Each structure stands twice: as structure tokens, then as C-alpha cells.
Amino acid sequence: NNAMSVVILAAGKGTRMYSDLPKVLHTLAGKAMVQHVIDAANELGAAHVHLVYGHGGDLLKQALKDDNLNWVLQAEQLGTGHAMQQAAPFFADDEDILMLYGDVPLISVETLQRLRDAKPQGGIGLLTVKLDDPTGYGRITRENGKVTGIVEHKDATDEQRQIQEINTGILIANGADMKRWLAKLTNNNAQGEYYITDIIALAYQEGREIVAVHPQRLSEVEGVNNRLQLSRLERVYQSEQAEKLLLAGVMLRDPARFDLRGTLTHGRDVEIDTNVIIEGNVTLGHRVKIGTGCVIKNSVIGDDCEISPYTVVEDANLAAACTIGP
Amino acid sequence: NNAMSVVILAAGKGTRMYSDLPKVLHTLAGKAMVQHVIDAANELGAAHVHLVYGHGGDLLKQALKDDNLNWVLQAEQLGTGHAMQQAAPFFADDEDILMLYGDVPLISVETLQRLRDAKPQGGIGLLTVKLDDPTGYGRITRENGKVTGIVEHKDATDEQRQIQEINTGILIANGADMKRWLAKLTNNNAQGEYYITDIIALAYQEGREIVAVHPQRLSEVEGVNNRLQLSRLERVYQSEQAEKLLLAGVMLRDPARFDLRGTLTHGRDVEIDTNVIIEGNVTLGHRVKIGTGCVIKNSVIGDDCEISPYTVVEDANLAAACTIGP
Amino acid sequence: NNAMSVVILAAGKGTRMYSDLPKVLHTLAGKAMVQHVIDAANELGAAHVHLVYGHGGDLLKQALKDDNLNWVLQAEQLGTGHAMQQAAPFFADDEDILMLYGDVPLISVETLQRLRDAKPQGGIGLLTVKLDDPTGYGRITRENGKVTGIVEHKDATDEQRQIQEINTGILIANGADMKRWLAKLTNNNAQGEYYITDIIALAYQEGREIVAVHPQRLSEVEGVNNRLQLSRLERVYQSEQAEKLLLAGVMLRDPARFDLRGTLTHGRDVEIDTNVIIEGNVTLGHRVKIGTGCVIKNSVIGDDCEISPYTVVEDANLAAACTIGP
Ligand SMILES: CC(=O)N[C@H]1[C@@H](OP(=O)(O)OP(=O)(O)OC[C@H]2O[C@@H](n3ccc(=O)[nH]c3=O)[C@H](O)[C@@H]2O)O[C@H](CO)[C@@H](O)[C@@H]1O
Ligand SMILES: CC(=O)N[C@H]1[C@@H](OP(=O)(O)OP(=O)(O)OC[C@H]2O[C@@H](n3ccc(=O)[nH]c3=O)[C@H](O)[C@@H]2O)O[C@H](CO)[C@@H](O)[C@@H]1O
Ligand SMILES: CC(=O)N[C@H]1[C@@H](OP(=O)(O)OP(=O)(O)OC[C@H]2O[C@@H](n3ccc(=O)[nH]c3=O)[C@H](O)[C@@H]2O)O[C@H](CO)[C@@H](O)[C@@H]1O
Incomplete structure (x- = not known):
């Protein structure tokens, strides 16, 4: 069990919640969604927990004051890769960096531990799920059964869109390798943002191996964007x-x-x-x-x-x- | 938006409710089922609302006293067409006549408005749904994709019974055309009743066009006959x-x-x-x-x-x- | 309606309940599971009700003191056939013996009555259900559409395991015939226990007929082994x-x-x-x-x-x- 830290991306807006309370602070069983993620990170053994936030740092910092979090400000919301780039300077080359979302409250420590175990050396452990309708989600590309990259729905062709296995967004890799791939992230794609998902093709190209693991239950990787979806997870x-x-x-x-x-x-x-x-x-x-x-x-x-x-x-x-x- | 009135058929018995309260008066969320229909008719812009009733006119008239309804007594329950014939004398030739059931409480104004919009001129706007098992419901007959009539289950053959698209009972047409077809309704069929559904074949024969529209949700056209079905809609x-x-x-x-x-x-x-x-x-x-x-x-x-x-x-x-x- | 008695097998452990209360005493709607079975037996017309128990006879006898039960101790839990053998001495040759489980609380008197009606003379009336996954349950064997025996999952081959129709465990036969087959029960099989199910092949061999009947609802033959399954039946x-x-x-x-x-x-x-x-x-x-x-x-x-x-x-x-x- 190589040392490991966790990065939680909780910088997105949260517009469809129609609330003056930052989305990731809304409770699931009396506990803010992000606290669930933070608790999961800690029980998993995270040495450090980097919380990447946009604004409300004050509401967020006040609410989560009893946690030893390393606050990482993502000035503008320019994609998951960009949010990761802000946190990178803090990853230790000697540890694994597991990435989680602050609005996917039910991720289990069991599934994350299986992810850690499946992460090859110098490689990437990726959490994927086969959906009936994969619309809107990153498609997992394979070549002779091996993960080669992730193509965002908007960037995929009609042929690639037929791929059912999608990216849940959760992944783990060595921090040194992570820093290196993060530095190479480009922003010209269907959405002009830095895609953390591009690190998959980058790892494959360097000859490194990407191993996909699956969650025990689909609800375990469900992200919340409005109260209706939060109530379903509750x-x-x-x-x-x-x-x-x-x-x-x-x-x-x-x-x-x-x-x-x-x-x-x-x-x-x-x-x-x-x-x-x-x-x-x-x-x-x-x-x-x-x-x-x-x-x-x-x-x-x-x-x-x-x-x-x-x-x-x-x-x-x-x-x-x-x-x-x- | 041509002027329009609405006829609500609420004259059926309601035997399986085992109640001393007229069926259409039983509440769905604290509002009598028929009030739901009446509210929907009014929000839709109905200039007049004709309520066709059998007996209990007193309980009904007392309960619905705060509504400007035109009471239309259907002496004996001789079919939807017969119930419509009693209301006919009140339709204005210058308006559309939309017909609804007093025991289908969840019909939405959105769906009714789409029905109004789909009603061709001199034609009939019909609300139909494709069921897995269409047993017991009027079958929609088509010829080269066009609605030609409605055949009641009991009147259909084994071949026609295979038709899945059925009549929800809701329809709209010009009052003048309605009066005319209503006058031609016959009562010799599998049930010896005046079928309002026969007006479809009659409109097709006159060369007029029948356009079928579908409801957003199936529950929106669910009729209630007993408390178990009412509880399901609640x-x-x-x-x-x-x-x-x-x-x-x-x-x-x-x-x-x-x-x-x-x-x-x-x-x-x-x-x-x-x-x-x-x-x-x-x-x-x-x-x-x-x-x-x-x-x-x-x-x-x-x-x-x-x-x-x-x-x-x-x-x-x-x-x-x-x-x-x- | 030949006279009839009932045997309820309630001698199994109940380990997964994690309770100091005998499993069959846990309530389903304020009534111990076994009382449900006992009530069903009595309404069906059972002249005698034999309750086969392992230990806790005291808790059980105290709880069920207001019932005229004939207590039958099954010293060790050596299979349903063994449990039946202990009760056998009490079956009257002039009556039918219906067998039920003390942990299948929702068996209905309607279904049991249909079972009684389907029991041929000198034959066995058997209650079976076709499951999607029949794993773990006795497989019903047939020859030219006729029931010939029951093969326990563990004793079945890969071919027989494909059989979907399984034994619900409930059955009825004449007491004299029952005594006779019970006496012939052997204990060498995949589990070294006396299988009451072997009486089916034994009845077929004697040239007698076994008629399978099916329950109205699958929940009606659901046995409870833990609280989660009890809550589902509640x-x-x-x-x-x-x-x-x-x-x-x-x-x-x-x-x-x-x-x-x-x-x-x-x-x-x-x-x-x-x-x-x-x-x-x-x-x-x-x-x-x-x-x-x-x-x-x-x-x-x-x-x-x-x-x-x-x-x-x-x-x-x-x-x-x-x-x-x-
Ligand atoms: C490029 C990329 O990563 N694509 C994945 C991402 O897409 P996608 O970018 O569409 O997902 P979201 O916009 O919901 O963002 C995911 C998470 O990242 C956070 N966030 C997003 C943008 C930002 O600038 N800062 C930030 O912190 C959000 O707050 C949320 O916690 O998640 C999906 C799962 O839901 C995956 O199937 C997609 O393959
Ligand atoms: C001939 C006809 O119209 N057939 C349709 C009608 O059949 P069907 O006549 O079988 O339907 P119902 O008997 O339930 O009657 C429908 C509505 O009409 C009212 N009512 C009925 C008879 C009467 O004499 N007076 C009266 O007011 C009832 O109170 C109810 O509000 O509804 C079904 C939907 O449920 C459609 O699929 C059928 O194609
Ligand atoms: C050999 C046999 O009968 N097999 C059937 C039995 O298997 P099986 O023996 O596996 O079923 P269980 O162990 O659950 O026992 C069934 C019932 O018998 C009682 N019991 C069991 C053993 C004992 O020594 N004493 C006793 O009283 C239990 O308390 C329970 O009420 O039930 C299944 C339904 O659940 C059927 O599909 C199987 O074909």
C-alpha cells in the first residue's frame, strides 16, 4: 500500500440547486456531500486531502473547518484537468494521487481500495461503468482489450459514441506521473477546457498501462447536480x-x-x-x-x-x- | 386559438367505489376528481363547461356550487355518444368542443393544448396511447397511416384486437361538425349504446381529417373506477x-x-x-x-x-x- | 374433503436472525410467523397440527400455549424427511397429511385448498414454482409431462440444474402412504440427511401419481431466514x-x-x-x-x-x- 493522497474536485457551479448554499455542502443523511467524500478519502488512508474549490471558499472553509484539508483554489472553471493542474504542485512524487468528485457522495472505500489494488505500476487505475445509455459521458477506448484513452462525448464521433463503457471520473496514478501528464494537458477540444481524461491517452502513449475497475453499485458513482438527484441518493x-x-x-x-x-x-x-x-x-x-x-x-x-x-x-x-x- | 368549450362526461355509476359519495367527487389531493378536470378545462380557456351527470345531481351541484358549470342531465346511461347528444344543443357552431371524462383526474393542460393545436380544420383532434395490452379499449383504425375510425373492443374482430393504439376517450372537434355527427349516431352494436367513438368514422367519411396526439405520461389518461386505482393516481x-x-x-x-x-x-x-x-x-x-x-x-x-x-x-x-x- | 392433519417443520436453527428469540416466533404483522402457518392450517380444516421443533421447546411452547398443537421433537436436524419421520407415528392412515414450513408465513388457505383438490388418490399433491434462477432448490423431474421425483440442487447434475420448476416444500399425501414412504427414506446423498423429497420418486415407483399445483403469488411460498427477508414479506x-x-x-x-x-x-x-x-x-x-x-x-x-x-x-x-x- 504505497502512500497516497486524494484530490477532490468541488469547484463546479451548482446552478440547478437554486440555493445560496454551495452545492457540495448540501447534506446526504445530515452530512455534507463533500464530507462523505472526505470521510471516504481519510478511511482509505489519504495522507493529504486537497479540496479544489471555485468560490464560497469562506462558506466552505467555515463549514469544513474541522478537517485537515489543503485548500486549492481553481480561479476559473476550465475543466477537470485544469482543476487538477492547480492541485499538482502539492502531489508528492512518492505517493499515489487518487482523484474524486465532491458531488459523488456514495463512493465506497471498498471500491476505492479495489481501484488502488488494480493500479499497475507507473500506470493508471481507472473506475468505469457500462451504461445502457452512455450519452454525455467520457467513452472508454480500448485496443485489443486494453484501455488506450477516454474520449469526451462531445469530442467522440457517432461510431465512438456507441461505446457503452464510460468514465466515472475517479482515477488513481503516481503523483510524479500525474504532474508530468498534467503539465502536457492541452485545451483545444469540443469545449476548450483542460480534460483530466486526456491523461489516459498520454499514459498509454508513454507505454504505461491503464486498468479499469468497476464500482459495486452504480449509485456509488452518481453525481448530484440538483435536489431531485440528491433525494434519490438519500x-x-x-x-x-x-x-x-x-x-x-x-x-x-x-x-x-x-x-x-x-x-x-x-x-x-x-x-x-x-x-x-x-x-x-x-x-x-x-x-x-x-x-x-x-x-x-x-x-x-x-x-x-x-x-x-x-x-x-x-x-x-x-x-x-x-x-x-x- | 378558436373559442372553445368543454364537455365532461361524469354520468357513469361508480359501483366499485362502494360509497354513498358520487365517484367523481372523491378527492385526489383534497380536490374532487371532477374539480381537477374542471380546473384543467378552465385553465385551458374553456368558455363553458358542460358537466354531464346521471344522478346525485344534488350532491354534485352542492359540492360544485362555486363553479360556473352548465348542468346536462343524462337520464339513462346509454353510452358516451348518448351522453354527448344531451350536451350537443349547448355547443356553439363557432367553437371547438373538447370532451373529457370526470374520472380521469390527471389530464394536463399541456397535453390538452397540444391536442387543440393538432386538431385540423373541420377535423378531429384525438388523444390516443399505444398500450402493451389494449384489451377493453377502443382500437384506433388507420389506412395508409391515417386515422379512419375507432372500433370498440367488444365490436372488434380478433384481427383488429391486435391493434395496440387505443382511444383515451379525449377528443376535440368543431361544435357544428360535432352536432352533425352526434345526430347521426346509431345504437346497434355489441353493446346497444350510442358510441361517441363512431364520430371518427363519420368524420373520415365526410372527407375530414382525424389527427391523433399522445399524452406525455400514461397516468395522465388513467380513469378511476375503484379506490385502489384512485390511490395509485394520488x-x-x-x-x-x-x-x-x-x-x-x-x-x-x-x-x-x-x-x-x-x-x-x-x-x-x-x-x-x-x-x-x-x-x-x-x-x-x-x-x-x-x-x-x-x-x-x-x-x-x-x-x-x-x-x-x-x-x-x-x-x-x-x-x-x-x-x-x- | 377427506379428513386431514398438518405437520409444520419449524426445527431449523435460524442462525442469520442473530436473536435470542426462536426464528419462527418473530412476528409478521404482530403475529409470529409460525402462528400464521398454524392459523392457515386450522382455517383449512386441519384436525391436528403437529409442530416439529428442535430446541426452545420452552420458549415455543410458552408462546404458542393457546394452540392445540401436538409437539414433535426433532432431536437433531437431519433433514426434512427425518423431521417428518418423527411426526409419522402420529399421522392417521385415514387422513391426508399436509406438510408446511414454520418459516413460510404467507402460504394462503386458497392455495392449500387447491393443493388438496389436486392430490390424486394414493398420490401426492405437490406445490411447485418455476423460477428464473432455481439455484439451491429441489428440481422437479418429469417424464412425458409427469412428475417422477425431486432432485436436490446439490444432488442434481449440470443438466438437471437447468430445470426451472422447483419444490416449494409444501406437499400433501395420505398418511398411510406417508408412513410407508417415510419408513423407506435413506440418508446417503449430497448432504447425508433424510430428504422428505425422496418420497416423490418413491410414490412414482409404487405407480402412484404426483400432481404439481402452483401458488397464486411467489411471496406466498417465501421462507424467512433473516430479518431482511422478513421485512420484505411484512x-x-x-x-x-x-x-x-x-x-x-x-x-x-x-x-x-x-x-x-x-x-x-x-x-x-x-x-x-x-x-x-x-x-x-x-x-x-x-x-x-x-x-x-x-x-x-x-x-x-x-x-x-x-x-x-x-x-x-x-x-x-x-x-x-x-x-x-x-
Ligand atoms: C473532461 C472530463 O473530466 N470528463 C469527465 C467529467 O466530465 P464533466 O466535465 O462533464 O463533469 P462535470 O462538469 O460534472 O465535472 C465533474 C466534477 O469536476 C468538478 N469540476 C468541473 C470543472 C471544473 O472546472 N472544476 C471542477 O472542479 C465538478 O465540480 C464535479 O465535481 O465527468 C464525467 C462523470 O460525471 C465523465 O464521464 C467525463 O468523462
Ligand atoms: C364508446 C366509447 O366511448 N368507448 C371508449 C370509452 O369506453 P367505455 O364506454 O367503456 O368507458 P366508460 O364506461 O368507463 O365511460 C367513460 C366515461 O364516460 C362516462 N359515461 C359512460 C357511459 C354513459 O352513459 N355516460 C357517461 O357519462 C363515464 O362516467 C366515464 O367518465 O372509454 C375508453 C377509455 O376509458 C375508450 O378506450 C373507449 O374507446
Ligand atoms: C430435502 C428437502 O426437503 N429439500 C427442499 C427443502 O430444502 P432445504 O432442506 O434446503 O430447506 P431448509 O433447510 O430451509 O428447510 C426447510 C424447512 O424445514 C425445516 N427443517 C429443515 C431441516 C431439519 O432437520 N428440520 C427442519 O425442521 C426448516 O426449519 C424449514 O422450515 O426446502 C426447499 C424450499 O425452501 C425445497 O426447494 C427443497 O427441495
């Missing part, structure tokens, strides 16, 4: 967590009407009825029964406690065998 | 509205657990948690936060107000920056 | 009941957010809003309106009563025309 997220809990032994009367917005520690034989929301750090002891519609926030509920329907439990530590409610 | 409706709101900038913690039953006016960055119900006319100022499970009814909530979970806000105007709840 | 169950109620004339504002956990008696034109839970025996008179999120438990609510949102009605009989709530 559901995928909530639902994925409800199932883990059911499988781990917590009875959810309806996993579709359960919301975990923080961290739940639970005992054995816990029962949670419908429309229950768990916020912040919550601990549920053994055989705790949560009535329908309760909101439990930053609390600790002792073993055998029963909480009646619609109770809000907040900032509390409840003694075992409690009966909270009529 | 969901399609609620869900369609939740998405509009998300796309317009209102954060819904779960668009699947949100119910708008009236009219919502909102500011920027409003947050609405799960299981919230909005009834009647509601106004939500900027950055208002609605806790899970609140019911907000005919209220105005000032900017920055926060409403705690499960609060019922009714008949109230709440001053800005209010904190309603523990 | 939803199928709740949803199936919500639709019956809608079709029977009760308006559910959202059949997806309705939970019946007991028995509901209702009048005409009852309205139940979202997130309502009905527990125990509940009676709703005519035109009762239940506000969103109410919990009604072992109560009787008189005609025309209106219950405000989030009210818990428990152990109460409410006089007609009551207004419970602000």
Missing part, C-alpha cells in the same frame, strides 16, 4: 443502511421508512418501528423498542427501554428498562 | 409534484413521503422533512424548516421559521424567525 | 392487505404507508390517512376519519368519529360522532 443511501441493519440483527418494521442520519450503535434484538429517524451519535442497548415515528438524536438509550410512538429523544442518556411514554 | 400525482418542488429548489427529505393537498408558495432554501402534509393554501418563506410529520394547513410561515416534528400548523400566519416547538 | 403482506381494503371500500391515503397488525372490522366510507397503524382487534364504524399517523389498538371507534393526526387510540370504545383531537 434514498439509496438510507435503504442500503436499513438493509445492513436488518441483516445485522436490528428489526426495522419497514426499511423504506427508516432514516439514519449519523451513527448508530446497537445491541441485540433492538426493534425500530416505522418512520423513525436516528440523528447524530445514537446508541441503542439490547432489546430497546423504538415506537413509530420517534426521532432519536445524540442519545444513549439503555437496554430494555421502550420508547412510545412519536417521542423525540434528544441529548439524553436514558437509564436501562425505561418506559418513555404513556 | 401517488403518481404526489410524486410528480414532489419532483417539481425538488427541481424548483425545495429540499424534500423523501419525495415519496410528501403530500401536497392544495397550493404551496415557497421561498428559497426551504427544507421539508419526511411525512409532511401540505393542505389548502400554504406559504413557506425563505429558509423555513419543516420537521418530520408536520401538517401545515392554510397557513403562512414567515422566513427562517423552524417547525418542530409533528406540529400541526393550521389557520395561522407565523411571524418570521419563529421557533415552533421544543 | 411489506408484501401489508401491501396485499391495503389493496384488499381499498378494493373493499376503505380509502387509504397511501396503501404503502399503512400497517394492519391484527384484525380490522370497518364500516362504509372510512378514511385512513398515511402512516396509520392498526393493532389487535380494531373496529371502525361508518365514515370514521383517521388522521395521519394514528395508532389504533384494540379499540372500537363509533360511526362518524374523527381522530386527529398522531393520536394513539388504545383499549378504548369511542362513542359515535366523537372528535378526538384539537
Whole structure:
């Protein structure tokens, strides 16, 4: 496991959110989208986390003040490659540089670790997915089964557009190699921007190998640009967590009407009825029964406690065998 | 945009509802199904709205008393054509007559306007949809790509039954032409009723042109005959509205657990948690936060107000920056 | 309708539930899974109900104390055939013996009755379903369209594994014939256990006929082994009941957010809003309106009563025309 840092590109506008709050700060389960990415980067072992931002550096820096982030300003939004070029001076030649988006909140550490493992030496580990309709996304080009480059939809021909495997945007490479390819990025293409994706053809040309890996679930690489798409991920997220809990032994009367917005520690034989929301750090002891519609926030509920329907439990530590409610 | 009136056929029984309330009066989002149709007719610009009813004229007339409807009694239920014949004497030869059903609540003004635009002169604008299983519905007959008539399922052969394009029942034509074809309607067919659908073959025979248009969504032409089907539309409706709101900038913690039953006016960055119900006319100022499970009814909530979970806000105007709840 | 008894095999471990409560005792709508099976057996007319258990006989016997069950201990879990062999001494030669699983809670009396009707004389009535992926399930073998036996996945070849029709495990036969085949069960196969499924080849060999019947819905033969699968059935169950109620004339504002956990008696034109839970025996008179999120438990609510949102009605009989709530 060679040392590694992570770069999060969170400099895009976020126009379709119609909000005075920077897009990547909007929450997915009570945690800003970008914090999800940052948490994933850190659990993965990132020695440094470079956050590339456009404006709102103040809102962003204030919100993310409790994180050891290296702030990298991308003055104008001239493409992913350009955003990467601003961060380059900070990559260490002795480490791998993994790149992530600040608006793709569900990327898992498991998938990123598999990406790290698939990155050949001097090569690029790329995360790709085969879509039914690949429209609008970078097409993966291959030659005798080997990745040779990425062609942006707008730059692709009608023939290349038929390619289904597309770029999720996440990739990893050695920092020295990264610096070198970044320096060679050109800006004349269908959109006059520096494409980080051009580094693929550049690595292939240098004779280096690009290995594509695939994500476990497609939602794991879904980017958010408006609230409708954020709500869809909130559901995928909530639902994925409800199932883990059911499988781990917590009875959810309806996993579709359960919301975990923080961290739940639970005992054995816990029962949670419908429309229950768990916020912040919550601990549920053994055989705790949560009535329908309760909101439990930053609390600790002792073993055998029963909480009646619609109770809000907040900032509390409840003694075992409690009966909270009529 | 030639002047136009609308006829709503709401005279059928409604037996499978098992209710002492006339079927078309049952609500879809707090509004009787037929009111939805009536509202759609009016927003479309209908100069007159003819409501064709069987019995319950009293319940119906009482309920819909605040509407300028022209009541047209259909003594016995002898088919859509017969119901139309009762309304005919009221069509003006100088206007288009659009026909709608009182139990197809989600027909959109957008689709109806496209129908109006597709109605050739002296011709008929018809709304049709291609179904996977067209069983039970009028089959659209064509000759060299042109609509020639409609054959009712029961009247169709095994060969014609294979036709997938069916009649949604909604159509528009000039009133003079309508009067004329209505007068020629016959009642000897598989069901001994006057079929309004026979006017299609009649218009084709007179050398006039029938143009079929399609609805944006299939739910838009779904008729309700029992509560199960009404509940399905309530969901399609609620869900369609939740998405509009998300796309317009209102954060819904779960668009699947949100119910708008009236009219919502909102500011920027409003947050609405799960299981919230909005009834009647509601106004939500900027950055208002609605806790899970609140019911907000005919209220105005000032900017920055926060409403705690499960609060019922009714008949109230709440001053800005209010904190309603523990 | 020849006399008949039922054997419920509920002796398996239940390891993936991670609970100190025997798996078949976990509730599906407030009723232990096995009680569902037992209720189905009794409504079907079972003269005796043999419950085959491994351990927890005490928890099980205590929980099911109000049922006239004949307890049959299966000392070690050596296969369905072995579990059946323990119960055999109790089958009467003059009755049919229907076999069910204690962890397949949604089997319907309708489907079981059709199974009884399809059981030839001296033959076996078998319940089978064609799956897309039949992996892990007993394959149904046929010869010229006739059932000849069942081959367990692990015992099947690659060719037999292609068979899609699988054994749901439910079957019925004469007790005398059952005793006889059970006595001949062998334990040398891919899993060294007594397979009740071997009785099929045994019945075919004796020249007797095996008739396969299919369940109305696949969920009806779904077995539960972990809480995630139990939650999925709770939803199928709740949803199936919500639709019956809608079709029977009760308006559910959202059949997806309705939970019946007991028995509901209702009048005409009852309205139940979202997130309502009905527990125990509940009676709703005519035109009762239940506000969103109410919990009604072992109560009787008189005609025309209106219950405000989030009210818990428990152990109460409410006089007609009551207004419970602000
Ligand atoms: C040239 C390139 O990289 N193309 C890929 C990129 O395209 P594409 O450039 O179209 O994607 P986006 O514009 O959404 O940008 C992706 C991410 O980069 C950030 N961003 C973008 C521009 C900028 O100047 N600064 C910045 O920080 C955004 O905030 C977002 O987090 O993502 C797609 C996945 O969604 C891939 O299928 C495309 O192959
Ligand atoms: C002959 C005819 O028109 N056939 C069409 C009609 O059939 P069909 O006659 O079978 O449809 P319905 O019986 O449901 O009636 C449709 C509408 O007309 C009303 N109504 C019906 C009979 C009556 O005497 N008075 C009255 O007002 C009903 O209340 C309902 O609003 O609708 C279908 C769509 O659902 C179309 O696919 C069929 O091609
Ligand atoms: C040999 C046999 O019967 N195979 C069938 C059985 O397999 P299979 O043996 O794999 O199924 P399970 O192990 O789940 O057991 C089925 C039922 O029998 C009970 N049980 C099992 C073993 C035991 O010693 N005692 C006992 O009581 C379980 O508690 C459960 O209620 O069910 C499948 C459906 O799920 C069928 O497709 C298989 O063809």
C-alpha cells in the first residue's frame, strides 16, 4: 500500500440547486456531500486531502473547518484537468494521487481500495461503468482489450459514441506521473477546457498501462447536480443502511421508512418501528423498542427501554428498562 | 386559438367505489376528481363547461356550487355518444368542443393544448396511447397511416384486437361538425349504446381529417373506477409534484413521503422533512424548516421559521424567525 | 374433503436472525410467523397440527400455549424427511397429511385448498414454482409431462440444474402412504440427511401419481431466514392487505404507508390517512376519519368519529360522532 493522497474536485457551479448554499455542502443523511467524500478519502488512508474549490471558499472553509484539508483554489472553471493542474504542485512524487468528485457522495472505500489494488505500476487505475445509455459521458477506448484513452462525448464521433463503457471520473496514478501528464494537458477540444481524461491517452502513449475497475453499485458513482438527484441518493443511501441493519440483527418494521442520519450503535434484538429517524451519535442497548415515528438524536438509550410512538429523544442518556411514554 | 368549450362526461355509476359519495367527487389531493378536470378545462380557456351527470345531481351541484358549470342531465346511461347528444344543443357552431371524462383526474393542460393545436380544420383532434395490452379499449383504425375510425373492443374482430393504439376517450372537434355527427349516431352494436367513438368514422367519411396526439405520461389518461386505482393516481400525482418542488429548489427529505393537498408558495432554501402534509393554501418563506410529520394547513410561515416534528400548523400566519416547538 | 392433519417443520436453527428469540416466533404483522402457518392450517380444516421443533421447546411452547398443537421433537436436524419421520407415528392412515414450513408465513388457505383438490388418490399433491434462477432448490423431474421425483440442487447434475420448476416444500399425501414412504427414506446423498423429497420418486415407483399445483403469488411460498427477508414479506403482506381494503371500500391515503397488525372490522366510507397503524382487534364504524399517523389498538371507534393526526387510540370504545383531537 504505497502512500497516497486524494484530490477532490468541488469547484463546479451548482446552478440547478437554486440555493445560496454551495452545492457540495448540501447534506446526504445530515452530512455534507463533500464530507462523505472526505470521510471516504481519510478511511482509505489519504495522507493529504486537497479540496479544489471555485468560490464560497469562506462558506466552505467555515463549514469544513474541522478537517485537515489543503485548500486549492481553481480561479476559473476550465475543466477537470485544469482543476487538477492547480492541485499538482502539492502531489508528492512518492505517493499515489487518487482523484474524486465532491458531488459523488456514495463512493465506497471498498471500491476505492479495489481501484488502488488494480493500479499497475507507473500506470493508471481507472473506475468505469457500462451504461445502457452512455450519452454525455467520457467513452472508454480500448485496443485489443486494453484501455488506450477516454474520449469526451462531445469530442467522440457517432461510431465512438456507441461505446457503452464510460468514465466515472475517479482515477488513481503516481503523483510524479500525474504532474508530468498534467503539465502536457492541452485545451483545444469540443469545449476548450483542460480534460483530466486526456491523461489516459498520454499514459498509454508513454507505454504505461491503464486498468479499469468497476464500482459495486452504480449509485456509488452518481453525481448530484440538483435536489431531485440528491433525494434519490438519500434514498439509496438510507435503504442500503436499513438493509445492513436488518441483516445485522436490528428489526426495522419497514426499511423504506427508516432514516439514519449519523451513527448508530446497537445491541441485540433492538426493534425500530416505522418512520423513525436516528440523528447524530445514537446508541441503542439490547432489546430497546423504538415506537413509530420517534426521532432519536445524540442519545444513549439503555437496554430494555421502550420508547412510545412519536417521542423525540434528544441529548439524553436514558437509564436501562425505561418506559418513555404513556 | 378558436373559442372553445368543454364537455365532461361524469354520468357513469361508480359501483366499485362502494360509497354513498358520487365517484367523481372523491378527492385526489383534497380536490374532487371532477374539480381537477374542471380546473384543467378552465385553465385551458374553456368558455363553458358542460358537466354531464346521471344522478346525485344534488350532491354534485352542492359540492360544485362555486363553479360556473352548465348542468346536462343524462337520464339513462346509454353510452358516451348518448351522453354527448344531451350536451350537443349547448355547443356553439363557432367553437371547438373538447370532451373529457370526470374520472380521469390527471389530464394536463399541456397535453390538452397540444391536442387543440393538432386538431385540423373541420377535423378531429384525438388523444390516443399505444398500450402493451389494449384489451377493453377502443382500437384506433388507420389506412395508409391515417386515422379512419375507432372500433370498440367488444365490436372488434380478433384481427383488429391486435391493434395496440387505443382511444383515451379525449377528443376535440368543431361544435357544428360535432352536432352533425352526434345526430347521426346509431345504437346497434355489441353493446346497444350510442358510441361517441363512431364520430371518427363519420368524420373520415365526410372527407375530414382525424389527427391523433399522445399524452406525455400514461397516468395522465388513467380513469378511476375503484379506490385502489384512485390511490395509485394520488401517488403518481404526489410524486410528480414532489419532483417539481425538488427541481424548483425545495429540499424534500423523501419525495415519496410528501403530500401536497392544495397550493404551496415557497421561498428559497426551504427544507421539508419526511411525512409532511401540505393542505389548502400554504406559504413557506425563505429558509423555513419543516420537521418530520408536520401538517401545515392554510397557513403562512414567515422566513427562517423552524417547525418542530409533528406540529400541526393550521389557520395561522407565523411571524418570521419563529421557533415552533421544543 | 377427506379428513386431514398438518405437520409444520419449524426445527431449523435460524442462525442469520442473530436473536435470542426462536426464528419462527418473530412476528409478521404482530403475529409470529409460525402462528400464521398454524392459523392457515386450522382455517383449512386441519384436525391436528403437529409442530416439529428442535430446541426452545420452552420458549415455543410458552408462546404458542393457546394452540392445540401436538409437539414433535426433532432431536437433531437431519433433514426434512427425518423431521417428518418423527411426526409419522402420529399421522392417521385415514387422513391426508399436509406438510408446511414454520418459516413460510404467507402460504394462503386458497392455495392449500387447491393443493388438496389436486392430490390424486394414493398420490401426492405437490406445490411447485418455476423460477428464473432455481439455484439451491429441489428440481422437479418429469417424464412425458409427469412428475417422477425431486432432485436436490446439490444432488442434481449440470443438466438437471437447468430445470426451472422447483419444490416449494409444501406437499400433501395420505398418511398411510406417508408412513410407508417415510419408513423407506435413506440418508446417503449430497448432504447425508433424510430428504422428505425422496418420497416423490418413491410414490412414482409404487405407480402412484404426483400432481404439481402452483401458488397464486411467489411471496406466498417465501421462507424467512433473516430479518431482511422478513421485512420484505411484512411489506408484501401489508401491501396485499391495503389493496384488499381499498378494493373493499376503505380509502387509504397511501396503501404503502399503512400497517394492519391484527384484525380490522370497518364500516362504509372510512378514511385512513398515511402512516396509520392498526393493532389487535380494531373496529371502525361508518365514515370514521383517521388522521395521519394514528395508532389504533384494540379499540372500537363509533360511526362518524374523527381522530386527529398522531393520536394513539388504545383499549378504548369511542362513542359515535366523537372528535378526538384539537
Ligand atoms: C473532461 C472530463 O473530466 N470528463 C469527465 C467529467 O466530465 P464533466 O466535465 O462533464 O463533469 P462535470 O462538469 O460534472 O465535472 C465533474 C466534477 O469536476 C468538478 N469540476 C468541473 C470543472 C471544473 O472546472 N472544476 C471542477 O472542479 C465538478 O465540480 C464535479 O465535481 O465527468 C464525467 C462523470 O460525471 C465523465 O464521464 C467525463 O468523462
Ligand atoms: C364508446 C366509447 O366511448 N368507448 C371508449 C370509452 O369506453 P367505455 O364506454 O367503456 O368507458 P366508460 O364506461 O368507463 O365511460 C367513460 C366515461 O364516460 C362516462 N359515461 C359512460 C357511459 C354513459 O352513459 N355516460 C357517461 O357519462 C363515464 O362516467 C366515464 O367518465 O372509454 C375508453 C377509455 O376509458 C375508450 O378506450 C373507449 O374507446
Ligand atoms: C430435502 C428437502 O426437503 N429439500 C427442499 C427443502 O430444502 P432445504 O432442506 O434446503 O430447506 P431448509 O433447510 O430451509 O428447510 C426447510 C424447512 O424445514 C425445516 N427443517 C429443515 C431441516 C431439519 O432437520 N428440520 C427442519 O425442521 C426448516 O426449519 C424449514 O422450515 O426446502 C426447499 C424450499 O425452501 C425445497 O426447494 C427443497 O427441495
